[PDB]
């Protein structure tokens, strides 16, 4: 599953549920077609990677999280483990997901 | 200085108000960091140039204005004259933004 998170409270509620494992956090919007794109994708993943967790953004609905996180072309992906930011990938490029994914795992 | 639209109604005033003359509009979000770098750039070209109308738009607050002009990333500069879109810009590349505008208006 893709969780979606509530506000920064959750976030940080998840970003420690997830222990040791790797985080991807889609950052979107509604009305961000290559979001909606990409979005199915990461949910396939998601089900398939037990040990990954997956989180969405909805950039409309924390803005405040969008603004920490120095968003701006989205969907915005962000790799973080241990609460800590790995990697970034701006845009709705699969592989390069992927790829980002298998390094960070 | 920069008009903010307030609905799709009020796109197609602007647009009207415009008459001739090129059009840039700004599609932005308070959340993010690039565009609040480069509003004071377009304040002072909206200040500076006659022969050209600057706009902008909250993603948050027209998000029906983003998903129509399939916004993805932020800022987005859309240049338009006489209703037709002429162009678009990714980014906040201000000299990029300022040869769209030379080569447009």
């Known amino acids: 599953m893709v969780y979606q998170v509530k506000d920064q409270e959750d976030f940080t509620k998840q970003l420690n549920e997830a222990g040791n494992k790797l985080v991807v956090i889609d950052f979107y919007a509604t009305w961000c077609g290559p ?7 990461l949910e396939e993943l998601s089900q398939s990677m037990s040990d990954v967790v997956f989180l969405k953004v909805d950039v409309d609905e924390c803005e405040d999280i969008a603004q920490d996180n120095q968003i701006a072309c989205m969907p915005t992906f962000l790799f973080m ?6 990697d970034s990938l701006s845009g709705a490029n699969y592989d390069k997901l992927l790829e980002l994914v298998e390094k960070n795992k």
Request: aromatic share 0%; proline share 8%.
């Open 35 to 41: 979001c909606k794109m990409i979005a199915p994708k």
């Open 81 to 86: 483990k241990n609460g800590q930011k790995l």
